[PDB]
Amino acid sequence: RFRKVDVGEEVDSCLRQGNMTAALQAALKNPPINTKSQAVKDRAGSIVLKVLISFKANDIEKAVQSLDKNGVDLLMKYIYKGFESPSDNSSAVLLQWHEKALAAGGVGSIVRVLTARKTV
Amino acid sequence: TTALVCDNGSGLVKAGFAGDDAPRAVFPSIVGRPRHQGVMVGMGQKDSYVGDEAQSKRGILTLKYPIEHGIITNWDDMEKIWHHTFYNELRVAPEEHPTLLTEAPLNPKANREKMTQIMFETFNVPAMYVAIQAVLSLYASGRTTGIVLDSGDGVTHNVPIYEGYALPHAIMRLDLAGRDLTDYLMKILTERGYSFVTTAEREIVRDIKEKLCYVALDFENEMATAASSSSLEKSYELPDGQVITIGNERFRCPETLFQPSFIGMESAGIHETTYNSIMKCDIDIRKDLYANNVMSGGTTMYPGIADRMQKEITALAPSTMKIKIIAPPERKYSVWIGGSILASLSTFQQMWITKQEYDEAGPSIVHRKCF
Amino acid sequence: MDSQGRKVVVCDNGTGFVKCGYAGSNFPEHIFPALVGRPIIRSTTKVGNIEIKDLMVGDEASELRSMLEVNYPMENGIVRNWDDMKHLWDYTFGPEKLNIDTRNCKILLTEPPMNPTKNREKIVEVMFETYQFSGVYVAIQAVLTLYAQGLLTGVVVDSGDGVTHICPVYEGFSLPHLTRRLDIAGRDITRYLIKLLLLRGYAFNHSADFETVRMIKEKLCYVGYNIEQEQKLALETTVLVESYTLPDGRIIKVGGERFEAPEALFQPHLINVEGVGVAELLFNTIQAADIDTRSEFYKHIVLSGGSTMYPGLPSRLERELKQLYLERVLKGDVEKLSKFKIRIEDPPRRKHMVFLGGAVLADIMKDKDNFWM
Amino acid sequence: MPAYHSSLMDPDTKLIGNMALLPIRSQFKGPAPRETKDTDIVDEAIYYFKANVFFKNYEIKNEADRTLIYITLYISECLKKLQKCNSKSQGEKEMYTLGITNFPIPGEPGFPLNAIYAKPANKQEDEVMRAYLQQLRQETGLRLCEKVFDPQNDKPSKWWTCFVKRQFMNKSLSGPGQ
Amino acid sequence: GRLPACVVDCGTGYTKLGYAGNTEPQFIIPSCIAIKESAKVGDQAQRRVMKGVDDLDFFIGDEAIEKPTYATKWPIRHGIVEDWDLMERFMEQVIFKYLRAEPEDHYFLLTEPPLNTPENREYTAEIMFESFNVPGLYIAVQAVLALAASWTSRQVGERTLTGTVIDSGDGVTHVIPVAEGYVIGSCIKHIPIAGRDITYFIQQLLRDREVGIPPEQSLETAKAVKERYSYVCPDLVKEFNKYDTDGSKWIKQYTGINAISKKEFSIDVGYERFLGPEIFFHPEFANPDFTQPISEVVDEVIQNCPIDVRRPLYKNIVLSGGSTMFRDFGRRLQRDLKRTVDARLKLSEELSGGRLKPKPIDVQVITHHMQRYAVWFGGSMLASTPEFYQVCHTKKDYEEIGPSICRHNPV
Numbered sequence A: 001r002f003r004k005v006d007v008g009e010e011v012d013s014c015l016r017q018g019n020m021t022a023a024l025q026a027a028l029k030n031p032p033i034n035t036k037s038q039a040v041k042d043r044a045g046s047i048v049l050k051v052l053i054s055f056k057a058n059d060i061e062k063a064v065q066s067l068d069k070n071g072v073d074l075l076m077k078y079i080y081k082g083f084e085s086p087s088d089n090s091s092a093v094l095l096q097w098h099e100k101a102l103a104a105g106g107v108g109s110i111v112r113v114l115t116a117r118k119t120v
Numbered sequence B: 001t002t003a004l005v006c007d008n009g010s011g012l013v014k015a016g017f018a019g020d021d022a023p024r025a026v027f028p029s030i031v032g033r034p035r036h037q038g039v040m041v042g043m044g045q046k047d048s049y050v051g052d053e054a055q056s057k058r059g060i061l062t063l064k065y066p067i068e069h070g071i072i073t074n075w076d077d078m079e080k081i082w083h084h085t086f087y088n089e090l091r092v093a094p095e096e097h098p099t100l101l102t103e104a105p106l107n108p109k110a111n112r113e114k115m116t117q118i119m120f121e122t123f124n125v126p127a128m129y130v131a132i133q134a135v136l137s138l139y140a141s142g143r144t145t146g147i148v149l150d151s152g153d154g155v156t157h158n159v160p161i162y163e164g165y166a167l168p169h170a171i172m173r174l175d176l177a178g179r180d181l182t183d184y185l186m187k188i189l190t191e192r193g194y195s196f197v198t199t200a201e202r203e204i205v206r207d208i209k210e211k212l213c214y215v216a217l218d219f220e221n222e223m224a225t226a227a228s229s230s231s232l233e234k235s236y237e238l239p240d241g242q243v244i245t246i247g248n249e250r251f252r253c254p255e256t257l258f259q260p261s262f263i264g265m266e267s268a269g270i271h272e273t274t275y276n277s278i279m280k281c282d283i284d285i286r287k288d289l290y291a292n293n294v295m296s297g298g299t300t301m302y303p304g305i306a307d308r309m310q311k312e313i314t315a316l317a318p319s320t321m322k323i324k325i326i327a328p329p330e331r332k333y334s335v336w337i338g339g340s341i342l343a344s345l346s347t348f349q350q351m352w353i354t355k356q357e358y359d360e361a362g363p364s365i366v367h368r369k370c371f
Numbered sequence C: 001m002d003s004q005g006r007k008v009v010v011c012d013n014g015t016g017f018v019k020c021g022y023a024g025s026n027f028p029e030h031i032f033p034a035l036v037g038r039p040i041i042r043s044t045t046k047v048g049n050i051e052i053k054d055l056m057v058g059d060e061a062s063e064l065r066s067m068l069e070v071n072y073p074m075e076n077g078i079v080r081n082w083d084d085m086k087h088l089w090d091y092t093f094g095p096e097k098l099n100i101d102t103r104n105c106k107i108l109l110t111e112p113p114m115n116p117t118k119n120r121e122k123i124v125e126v127m128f129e130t131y132q133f134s135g136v137y138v139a140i141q142a143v144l145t146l147y148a149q150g151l152l153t154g155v156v157v158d159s160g161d162g163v164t165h166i167c168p169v170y171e172g173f174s175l176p177h178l179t180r181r182l183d184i185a186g187r188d189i190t191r192y193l194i195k196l197l198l199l200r201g202y203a204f205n206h207s208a209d210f211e212t213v214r215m216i217k218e219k220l221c222y223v224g225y226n227i228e229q230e231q232k233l234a235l236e237t238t239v240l241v242e243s244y245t246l247p248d249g250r251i252i253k254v255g256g257e258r259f260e261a262p263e264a265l266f267q268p269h270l271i272n273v274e275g276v277g278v279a280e281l282l283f284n285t286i287q288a289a290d291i292d293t294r295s296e297f298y299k300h301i302v303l304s305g306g307s308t309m310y311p312g313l314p315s316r317l318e319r320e321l322k323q324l325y326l327e328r329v330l331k332g333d334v335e336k337l338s339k340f341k342i343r344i345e346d347p348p349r350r351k352h353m354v355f356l357g358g359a360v361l362a363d364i365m366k367d368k369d370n371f372w373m
Numbered sequence D: 001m002p003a004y005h006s007s008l009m010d011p012d013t014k015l016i017g018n019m020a021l022l023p024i025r026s027q028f029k030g031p032a033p034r035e036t037k038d039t040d041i042v043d044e045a046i047y048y049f050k051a052n053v054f055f056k057n058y059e060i061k062n063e064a065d066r067t068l069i070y071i072t073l074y075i076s077e078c079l080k081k082l083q084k085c086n087s088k089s090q091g092e093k094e095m096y097t098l099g100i101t102n103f104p105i106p107g108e109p110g111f112p113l114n115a116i117y118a119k120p121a122n123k124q125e126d127e128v129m130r131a132y133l134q135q136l137r138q139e140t141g142l143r144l145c146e147k148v149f150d151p152q153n154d155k156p157s158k159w160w161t162c163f164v165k166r167q168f169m170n171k172s173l174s175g176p177g178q
Numbered sequence E: 001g002r003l004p005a006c007v008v009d010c011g012t013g014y015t016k017l018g019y020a021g022n023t024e025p026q027f028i029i030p031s032c033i034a035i036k037e038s039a040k041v042g043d044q045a046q047r048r049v050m051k052g053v054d055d056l057d058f059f060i061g062d063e064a065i066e067k068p069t070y071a072t073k074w075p076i077r078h079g080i081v082e083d084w085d086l087m088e089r090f091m092e093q094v095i096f097k098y099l100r101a102e103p104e105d106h107y108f109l110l111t112e113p114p115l116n117t118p119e120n121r122e123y124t125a126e127i128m129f130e131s132f133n134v135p136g137l138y139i140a141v142q143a144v145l146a147l148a149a150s151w152t153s154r155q156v157g158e159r160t161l162t163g164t165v166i167d168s169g170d171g172v173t174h175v176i177p178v179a180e181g182y183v184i185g186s187c188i189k190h191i192p193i194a195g196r197d198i199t200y201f202i203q204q205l206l207r208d209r210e211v212g213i214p215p216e217q218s219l220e221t222a223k224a225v226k227e228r229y230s231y232v233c234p235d236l237v238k239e240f241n242k243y244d245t246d247g248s249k250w251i252k253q254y255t256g257i258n259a260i261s262k263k264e265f266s267i268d269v270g271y272e273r274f275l276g277p278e279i280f281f282h283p284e285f286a287n288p289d290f291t292q293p294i295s296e297v298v299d300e301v302i303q304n305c306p307i308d309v310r311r312p313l314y315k316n317i318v319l320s321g322g323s324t325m326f327r328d329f330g331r332r333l334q335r336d337l338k339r340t341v342d343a344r345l346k347l348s349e350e351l352s353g354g355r356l357k358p359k360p361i362d363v364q365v366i367t368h369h370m371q372r373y374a375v376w377f378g379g380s381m382l383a384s385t386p387e388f389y390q391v392c393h394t395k396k397d398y399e400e401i402g403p404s405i406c407r408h409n410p411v
């Protein structure tokens, strides 16, 4: 009986400007991280995965290398967002950014994604 | 037509047709449910035994009593007892027969009301009534005035009556009776190296209470003499063939009625309780109550209880008064025989709560018509 | 100690472990099991060069048990083999271990409550007829807990090897009629664990084997906090499975039996015993007490005896009391329960028959000790 | 448990040593006197032998059991030799040749049960042990010769030879080696 | 339903097949399966693993005891199923060949040995529901059925529904008390002594003495002498003295036929006759680590049962399974219990000064002809009833829950 009742409880203007690396540098300006908002977090990703898919493989190396250490850590949080619901083939591109990003950031850039208490 | 008299006391249920001289059926108010999983598919069907089956099968059953201290505590089990009473024990269907139930004083009114609701809604009786158990005991004696003492299994109470007028302010009650006397015996046998603990074995400790215990006429002399010799060391058999034998435990249990401090209750004993109730009565009644103490109920069956009680009141009351104790031989059935007399009475045939009155007023009618 | 320089000793006479020390010591000096036994030749064992006396006793009889037919002289708090009982004390006070070796120094005895009177009296005989002790006292086993804990009001839960007791004490008054026993103790949990491992296909049957499953019990078992959560974690995942090494080196593996065995304290119907679990027997005791005293017993539950050591038992016990109070006192008025101040004294030190309060605070020199008479 | 433990330890009998010295009925010579009744510790070990060897556990109930377990081991050693005998006559003399062999006395090393038998403390026990344990063996052999060889053909009788493989709780009076 | 339910009882020695309502099992067969063999084609590259349809070339029962070109396997040991691959192949051929049953249209009653682990009740249920699509299964406690077989056979004046059953089949012996139709699960005991270990003891006891027995047939002859010549004796050492003095006549002769050469061979049969059955009374003869005589294990059971039922349990002990058939096996167990029980009462006389004499317990041990199949016959009389069809698990319940519908057991 008794024991049953529990108790105890702007980006487009840089992209079409050709030097689209300047767009990605701009895409990192909109983190929702500190906010309590949730619809904005769905907007934040869509503004970046549209960018990630645009790169030629001739550039995806420098597009990582031109980031600062925060930039790589920032990027990895966007990478692990696209994997949560892939596009019809875009996983083929995220896994290619991941290759470059992990080369720059090392596994340490993953760990402060796993431990990130507030996120984009 | 004929009324049914049904003493739904705690302990032993008693039922039978009014006007008969002794109950047609008596059986224990216990409901027995199996304490091991039912697995011999076939004969081993019943999910809840009641009465004499449960008392018999007790080895495999967790017995429980649905009346605690005179207050009904599990109504689903109680309904099974009444259902057992009518359809199996009396073998008379309730729809044709008005029922005299009976109850202890100062019970919660919810007990009286729900007992009536069950009677009209489930068993569909023609009519019913709820007498207080004490005045029924006074009827059985053929007595116009006396102080009734019912000592049941779960309640002991005094009701003083004069010229058939009751004295409500002098009614007093004690929740110590044959059950707690048994639970105390089930302790003090451990002093001697036995052990009874299961609910079935509590039925064996009751049995020995009935056969061997007696009230001491001089308790301190009895203690001192019990230490002298094995002259008290009566012997009794368990169902296993183990033999147990008992000394001063024989009287220490009965004595609890006169010294409730043994079970740690603060109330005075039955003797001082009886005298206290007479001292509440109006002064000219008192002399006549002293001549008409009437004992009732099984707990008053112990050898020497009438004499011990006489001695105590004779010391406690004024020395010119002639204390006498009416202890009828049949006093175990006194309540039921009293009901059988009332349900035969030509005047009482107006007093029923008739069905249409409950249909009008609902359960609260019991407080209008019943005492 | 005495102004005469005499020393004073406490023996718990425990049903499973004798526990001994001098007055005022915060620790027992010697803990040893009450085994007494005789040499037996066994085919399954190489007979060593180690000398076996014609009666091994105590700690020695536990380590060399592989050659020994062992008895417990004490069962359920009653001496059932009085000769081995004498030999166990004759070992305790001899040159080995607590070498007082003398009549002159005092001994305290601890008796369970509701103890068959002849058991008590034979101890008081042999202490004065055989050791001829100069000073003896028999103390209420329940009060010694509160002396050691430094309290005067509270309800003592005292699950030893032999029997479990509950005894309220209110501001030092003994309330006897609120005593209760529950016949579940460390020995029955062990036998029940034997049966649970028998289902997993390990056979244990020698008297020497009983000590081994006791050592299993003490190291792997625990009491489930939310028994539904334990069952799901057993069903869903493997982590509860853990190894143990028997004396012969068999690497046996034990699983959900780690919690299914201790649970019997809360569910006596898993063993043959018909009754209520420790929490509900504790709750009914408080509820029987006089109405104003209940307010303090809920705040001063006190735990004693080795069978209370099981990981999580205080937490499990507190849960069942809160839920019982919600169900039967607050009548499901859940949010009110924030007002129910309940507290369990569960100090990690819990061989809780230590002697400081019972001896030195009771006598340095006094007429209280019974004496040669 | 219900293995056959030694019956003869009537307290009126002398109890020299760590074992019941007992009145071995024989025409050999030794420290023990002559029993006159028809039953004796060597006859007891012989009688219970076929049962005792199956019981895989055996207590020492009293001092006489530390005798009986040794007599049993020597009886086994008799069978370990008589089985080879070509006839009963050899079965007697080739048994006497066994009795006077230097068996490890229980306190001597290489005896299998040194945990169970205390050391003999002095010559007047040790030399008594030499003079008692031979008197056991010398007699024990001559009793088996009469009843292992069934009289039709002085074959060593099959039923007895079955037990050659079985040893009382798997202990051997060969010790760690002969 | 119209078609009868199947009752399939599987033991470690034998299995017992037939449809419910029959009075008697329609097949009794040994619990053996003879799988195909190879000249080390199975090896470290792969062990006993088949291809194509090579796995269906096997047989079970007596069709598998005497085939030369197959390796005999025994899937059930100590009553527990040890290798479910072979057991599932065994079940298939039971159903689709021996019983001719379509599993999709007959209820199954199938037996639990009271020791078995819950995982084995999952796996056995996974077979019948998920491999065979049985419409409903029930897993019955073997001992309770054995009592029902006594109950319907014995006279109506003593159909007590109360007794202790001793079920010494092969594998392990169960001692189980039933009071008024309820299993007292707390008191069940298991004794490891059983028909296999009595066989093995006799096999060793022969092979030490009586070499000449060909290695292919040692087991067969050990079984024969166990079945044909063995008896429970009155006093162990008194038999050894009788066998020595009257060795002309207590000794017996068994003649066997050589399976290969068809020459006969003979062995002298002797101490084998009373060793063996006395392993129940001296379990340490066969196991290092069990020692209580069966006559003292059965006492502990009743003495743990509730005080009221104790005497009735002594009044009605039922013997079940084949090993309990040994000559005098009832007589001795009754004598040992009687000698124990009335001596226990002699104590409680003296603790009361002889002032009262207790009504002595009579003890009865009951042998009845069903003993070789009382478990199946009980099963048949259960599975006949219309009640049985509602106690079974309907297949949908296996869909909604997992196989976990068989985790529960009444112990």
Ligand SMILES: Nc1ncnc2c1ncn2[C@@H]1O[C@H](COP(=O)(O)OP(=O)(O)O)[C@@H](O)[C@H]1O
Binding pocket: B007, B009, B010, B011, B012, B013, B151, B152, B153, B154, B178, B179, B206, B209, B210, B211, B297, B298, B299, B301, B302, B332, B335
């Ligand atoms: N000699 C006796 N015979 C029968 N009952 C006795 C005797 N002595 C004591 N009793 C007790 O009396 C009680 C029965 O009383 P009961 O008829 O139930 O009263 P009520 O029905 O008014 O509650 C039982 O507890 C029974 O054990």
Ligand SMILES: Nc1ncnc2c1ncn2[C@@H]1O[C@H](COP(=O)(O)OP(=O)(O)O)[C@@H](O)[C@H]1O
Binding pocket: C012, C013, C014, C015, C016, C017, C018, C159, C160, C161, C162, C185, C186, C187, C214, C217, C218, C219, C305, C306, C307, C309, C310, C351
């Ligand atoms: N750490 C532990 N965990 C679980 N059980 C334990 C632990 N320590 C001791 N026990 C058990 O407690 C019992 C002994 O407790 P103890 O207080 O000495 O009893 P007693 O004093 O009555 O002999 C034994 O069953 C022992 O196995």
Ligand SMILES: Nc1ncnc2c1ncn2[C@@H]1O[C@H](COP(=O)(O)OP(=O)(O)O)[C@@H](O)[C@H]1O
Binding pocket: E010, E011, E012, E013, E014, E015, E168, E169, E170, E171, E195, E196, E226, E227, E228, E321, E322, E323, E324, E325, E326, E372
């Ligand atoms: N005449 C007999 N005497 C003694 N035991 C027998 C006899 N005949 C058969 N047996 C034993 O009965 C067993 C038959 O199988 P049984 O034990 O009934 O089923 P299960 O295989 O379920 O245990 C045989 O293995 C054998 O051990």
Ligand SMILES: [Mg+2]
Binding pocket: B009, B133, B150, B151, B152, B296, B297, B298, B335
């Ligand atoms: Mg009454």
Ligand SMILES: [Mg+2]
Binding pocket: C012, C014, C015, C160, C161, C305
């Ligand atoms: Mg203790």
Ligand SMILES: [Mg+2]
Binding pocket: E011, E012, E169, E170, E321
């Ligand atoms: Mg079987």
